Structures are given as structure tokens and as C-alpha cells.
Amino acid sequence: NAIKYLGQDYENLRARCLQNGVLFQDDAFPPVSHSLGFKELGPNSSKTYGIKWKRPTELLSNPQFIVDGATRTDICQGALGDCWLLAAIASLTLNETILHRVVPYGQSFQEGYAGIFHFQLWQFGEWVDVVVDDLLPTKDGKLVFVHSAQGNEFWSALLEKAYAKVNGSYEALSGGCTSEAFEDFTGGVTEWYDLQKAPSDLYQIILKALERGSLLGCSINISDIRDLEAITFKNLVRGHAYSVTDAKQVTYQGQRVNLIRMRNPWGEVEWKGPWSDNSYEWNKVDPYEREQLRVKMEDGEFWMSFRDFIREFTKLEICNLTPDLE
Ligand SMILES: *[C@@H](O)[C@H](CCO)NC(=O)[C@H](CC(C)C)NC(=S)Nc1ccccc1
Ligand SMILES: [Ca+2]
Ligand SMILES: [Ca+2]
Numbered sequence: 001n002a003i004k005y006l007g008q009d010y011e012n013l014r015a016r017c018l019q020n021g022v023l024f025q026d027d028a029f030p031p032v033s034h035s036l037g038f039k040e041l042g043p044n045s046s047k048t049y050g051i052k053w054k055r056p057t058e059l060l061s062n063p064q065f066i067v068d069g070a071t072r073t074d075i076c077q078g079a080l081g082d083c084w085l086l087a088a089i090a091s092l093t094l095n096e097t098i099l100h101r102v103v104p105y106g107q108s109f110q111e112g113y114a115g116i117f118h119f120q121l122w123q124f125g126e127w128v129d130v131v132v133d134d135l136l137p138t139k140d141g142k143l144v145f146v147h148s149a150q151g152n153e154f155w156s157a158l159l160e161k162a163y164a165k166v167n168g169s170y171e172a173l174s175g176g177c178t179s180e181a182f183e184d185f186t187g188g189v190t191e192w193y194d195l196q197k198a199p200s201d202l203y204q205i206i207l208k209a210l211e212r213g214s215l216l217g218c219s220i221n222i223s224d225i226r227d228l229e230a231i232t233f234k235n236l237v238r239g240h241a242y243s244v245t246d247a248k249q250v251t252y253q254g255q256r257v258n259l260i261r262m263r264n265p266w267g268e269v270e271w272k273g274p275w276s277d278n279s280y281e282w283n284k285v286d287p288y289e290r291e292q293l294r295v296k297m298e299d300g301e302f303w304m305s306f307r308d309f310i311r312e313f314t315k316l317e318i319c320n321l322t323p324d325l326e
Contacts, residue, residue, distance in 0.1 A: 041171040060152055066153065071093050073150075078144050084176040088185060095321075121166060189324075195314050218317070237264065259306065
């Protein structure tokens with residue numbers, strides 16, 4: 001039932017390319033400099049020096065669309081300020097159902113491969129099917145923008161290309177709002193929380209939202225752009241979207257403590273305060289919980305106590321997946 005974005009028809013385009021023995025070349029979002037940007041990603045910018053658009057097949061012998069699931073570890077920001085989109089994609093992967101509504105099953109660099117992929121976005125009160133060819137910006141044989149921790153996996157690179165396409169170029173994605181991407185991925189409605197004015201029931205709100213599969217994001221508001229992406233003393237990033245990926249209570253020295261888990265879409269650079277991966281607090285928790293919850297890995301994902309979280313972060317976004325009609 002999805003609208004064909006720009007009347008481009010995924011199955012017909014793929015059937016024709018296979019028939020004519022060619023690879024799709026997307027005339028609606030060509031491998032050219034207007035698709036990158038005009039300013040920072042302008043043609044005469046040093047950011048775009050040496051960029052060549054390459055298909056994943058031109059990059060290695062065995063490219064894969066999905067390796068071991070479409071999971072949040074597949075989301076590692078490249079040279080673009082699209083943290084807000086990426087945080088929203090990492091959150092999306094927590095619920096398999098809505099994930100694969102955005103990223104339809106069956107997509108491959110083998111069976112049915114004609115250099116064309118497709119994704120479904122919610123735009124102006126309807127689901128739309130957006131195609132892209134798989135020419136991607138690379139420099140020295142490496143992806144410039146989003147990439148997966150798994151070097152041969154391409155679904156997230158292609159999803160971000162499709163989202164850049166609906167916005168006109170990659171550069172349109174620099175600076176934005178996690179909610180917008182949450183809504184584009186879901187049809188949901190977003191409610192936001194000022195963490196310095198949190199309702200006394202906010203942790204319960206978080207628990208229930210994550211149970212129901214809603215998308216959660218958080219950030220440290222900046223009011224001065226010299227603070228954009230500043231790293232804090234405890235290794236948070238300012239003006240930067242994180243994904244909220246879990247909320248669990250632990251038994252710490254016999255006491256119950258509210259923890260919250262989040263993920264920097266960079267795929268690295270984590271909190272170093274209490275509850276961090278190598279933090280001391282973990283030694284004092286139930287060993288079933290420690291083994292269940294704590295992973296010692298530089299992967300961008302970490303825990304904080306809810307107490308520290310509502311001190312350090314300033315904004316929480318919750319996207320509800322089943323909104324009321326109006
Ligand atoms: C994350 O990589 C980027 C870096 C910008 O170059 N940060 C943003 O896009 C932030 C993300 C928020 C704080 C969650 N948003 C910005 S800079 N501005 C903005 C624009 C539109 C709506 C809200 C916020
Ligand atoms: Ca994967
Ligand atoms: Ca970690």
C-alpha cells in the first residue's frame with residue numbers, strides 16, 4: 001500500500017535492470033556533487049576532496065546487506081552531523097517489527113541484485129517506498145558516512161543514503177532533531193522531557209515506553225555553538241544525539257538503583273562516570289545482573305544511574321508507536 005516516492009517503482013525498476021543486464025542508476029539522486037551538498041559538502045570543500053561514489057561490489061568481493069541482524073552496532077557515524085538520524089536508526093533496531101517495515105526483508109547483493117535497494121519512510125501522513133542505487137561516497141575505499149562495525153555490511157549506509165535522498169542531499173542531514181527521524185520511521189508522536197524538570201514518575205515512564213517498543217533518545221542542550229560536540233569532563237558529547245537503549249534496576253549493596261542505558265551513534269566515546277563499563281559500581285551488584293547487563297566493550301553504549309542521567313543530560317524524547325488519530 002506504500003506510495004511510490006517520485007513514482008519510482010522498486011520491483012519494476014529492478015526487473016528492467018535485470019532484463020537489460022544493467023545496474024540501476026538513480027536519476028532522482030545521482031552520484032554527483034549536488035547529492036553531497038553545497039556548503040560544507042560543497043564541490044570545492046576539502047571535506048569532499050577525493051570522494052568517489054562506489055557500489056559495495058566495487059569495494060570488496062562479498063558485500064552483504066545484513067550480517068547477523070540489522071542491530072545498533074551497525075550504526076557508526078561518519079563525517080556528517082546526522083547524529084539525530086543515526087540515534088533514531090539505532091533505537092529503531094530494538095523493535096524487529098518496525099525495523100523491517102523501514103528496511104524490508106529479502107534484500108541482497110546476490111538473488112535479484114541489480115544495484116537498487118528500497119526503504120519505507122512515513123512522510124506527510126503516508127508510508128512511501130524510496131529506492132536508491134547502491135553507489136555510496138567513499139574515500140580511499142572506505143565509506144565516508146555511516147558504516148557498520150561489520151566492514152562488509154551495507155543496509156545502514158543505504159538507509160542513510162535514502163534518508164539523505166528524501167531531504168535532497170547528505171548535507172541537509174547535518175544538524176537536526178531525533179524526533180523528526182523517530183516520526184519518519186514510525187508514524188508515532190513524540191513527547192519530550194526537560195530532565196531538570198522531570199516528573200517524579202519519569203523512570204516508570206521510561207520503563208513502560210521501552211517495554212511497549214517506543215523509541216527513546218537523549219541529548220545535552222547547548223546554547224552556544226562553540227559547545228557543539230564538545231566532550232565533557234566525564235566524556236559525554238554536547239549538542240549530540242544519543243539513543244536510549246534500555247532501563248534496568250540493579251541490586252547495589254542490597255539497595256535498588258535505577259540505571260539507564262544509552263548509545264553514542266559514533267559507536268565509540270562513552271561515559272566514564274559511575275556505572276561505566278570498567279566502573280567500580282559493578283563489583284557491588286548481583287552477579288546475575290552484572291553478567292546480564294554489563295558488557296566491557298568500546299562500542300559507544302554504556303550505563304548511567306538515572307540520578308546522574310537526569311543531572312548530565314538535559315532532554316529526553318519518547319516516540320510512541322501507536323498515537324491517537326488527531
Ligand atoms: C549530531 O551529530 C549533530 C552535530 C551537528 O553538526 N547534532 C545535532 O544535529 C543536534 C542533535 C540534537 C541536539 C539531539 N541538533 C542540532 S545541532 N540542532 C537542531 C536542529 C533542529 C532541531 C533540533 C536541534
Ligand atoms: Ca549487523
Ligand atoms: Ca561500552
